[PDB]
Amino acid sequence: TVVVTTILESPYVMMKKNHEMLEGNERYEGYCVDLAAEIAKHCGFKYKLTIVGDGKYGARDADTKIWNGMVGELVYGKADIAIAPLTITLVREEVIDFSKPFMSLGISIMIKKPQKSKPGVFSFLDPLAYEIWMCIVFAYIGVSVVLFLVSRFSPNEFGIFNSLWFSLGAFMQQGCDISPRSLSGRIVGGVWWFFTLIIISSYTANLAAFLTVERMVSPIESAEDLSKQTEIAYGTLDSGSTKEFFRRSKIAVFDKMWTYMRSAEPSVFVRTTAEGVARVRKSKGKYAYLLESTMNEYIEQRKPCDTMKVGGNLDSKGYGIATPKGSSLGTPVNLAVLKLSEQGVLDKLKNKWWYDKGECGAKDSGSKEKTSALSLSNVAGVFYILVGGLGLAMLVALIEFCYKSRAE
Template sequence: VLFLVSRFSPYEWHTEEFEDGRDQPPSDQTNEFGIFNSLWFSLGAFMQQGCDISPRSLSGRIVGGVWWFFTLIIISSYTANLAAFLTVERMVSPIESAEDLAKQTEIAYGTLEAGSTKEFFRRSKIAVFEKMWTYMKSAEPSVFVRTTEEGMIRVRKSKGKYAYLLESTMNEYIEQRKPCDTMKVGGNLDSKGYGIATPKGSALRGPVNLAVLKLSEQGVLDKLKSKWWYDKGECGSKDSGSKDKTSALSLSNVAGVFYILIGGLGLAMLVALIEFCYKSRSET
């Protein structure tokens, strides 16, 4: 844009003076902002090093000023985001898996008093889960809770000394709710699905199965989960591990400065057209 504006605006063209004081003929006017000098000016501004040439016309100066403002905001935003990334205090978890829980004794862990999670551990034949079940059923005081709300209160009051084991769907939902002081640790222990109960032999079974399958294939269920779990979440992040990360600088965060840049370039081209018309009219 700077190259085009400089070529179009008559105020960017000038005659050079010889060493003996003579001027160049008007037909030999020069323009400092060729394609390479325009790129050099842009690079110098972006690297905040400046350049030995500068625009003469108003339109060229508008381009230069808008570009300087754009580079200032972009570089400042990047620097601030990088500094936050390097200095953020990360939340470090002493446990990362069920194996870590089973190997230690400092952190207590339990489940809902009556629920699928407790039944999973009670019936499991996997050595790690059997060991965890043996601990849970013999622990004193009891590590089982009557409600999920009670379990979350116990987690918060324990100051890192109690882990509550529950279904991943509920875990992810709670994690996105205030006071935003809990996090999901490790992967899922098992894979199960939710179902819709109907009376035995009900004619609804087939249509309901097909409808749910269709919603799943179309991605509607994932969209609904994203909407109610994360988009309407109160902790501002979808990534369950994002508590120990800074948010990335996205395009939406700096969209305003791009609008200013585009608007400024458009204004500069309009001013260059006005300069050209004014100069042409004054010479006739």
């Protein structure tokens, strides 16, 4: 009777393992398969699912005007009914009819879900801000300055070269041989002692908080951070909606997109959705793939779990049944679309099929971690400051010999 045109994409149309073994009509399973079983039943018709041989979404060719992938089977009459995840757009509706939307979707960003980021060489000073480290320095100066001035007007081992050394080890938790032996002096060392005792305890407590609780970094989100960050390479699928909708960029943010989307190398587009899944997993911070929302949702729910949806829908779009213009069975479908939507067969099977394939959620966030031993990379910059301090130490040893030899 009727000819079904569609394409195999998860979770819509999915081949199982044993399609060579047993076919029946169960070569393909999914939400879109059973929704086609609903819409054929409510119309009464019986289907022949024929996925297109070229295997593309498709559009009419630029300057050649030939409908490519599923639009070729739908316009040129070799297929009639189309239960397919295809975008309703203007030039889509211009040549052939569509039904009501399956669901409310839009363009979503797919990034790699990051692992533990690499700390820098100076990541040891992470619990304290630059201002606090700087305020310690001027405090370290001013205390020994005061101790120099306190020891000036009272009868003397406390030179300006000496009082630096006392206040340093007091900050470094080390005891010193010479102690103040004056009331005004011992006030200054005491408040300096009570200073550092807070600070060392403060640095220890914040550092445990970084180790125990971990916060995850999302460098790019909400599509404005995409517009500023131009080290990420955007990706979409061509021969379809995301190509032309950004080719029809009119918002100033989308203009900054499409100028950069044309000026990119080499992945201005890709040609397979599963490739754009694989390419982001190989990209690792350099590249991103914009696509349909519920696809990015679903691939996140299939568990390699290294993916993430950020931001939100950049458009409002809907999946409707494509029918040729002046369809034999369009208005039969149009009523039977309303028969699905009136009680939510569109809702209820989508309730089932979206949670069906397993979940990637708060299951692995809770108790799939152990804190590790500290890497050398955590504490590496301490050694470079150490050996760099060792390198500077030998240099002062040489220039000591020069000014000592000028006692001639």
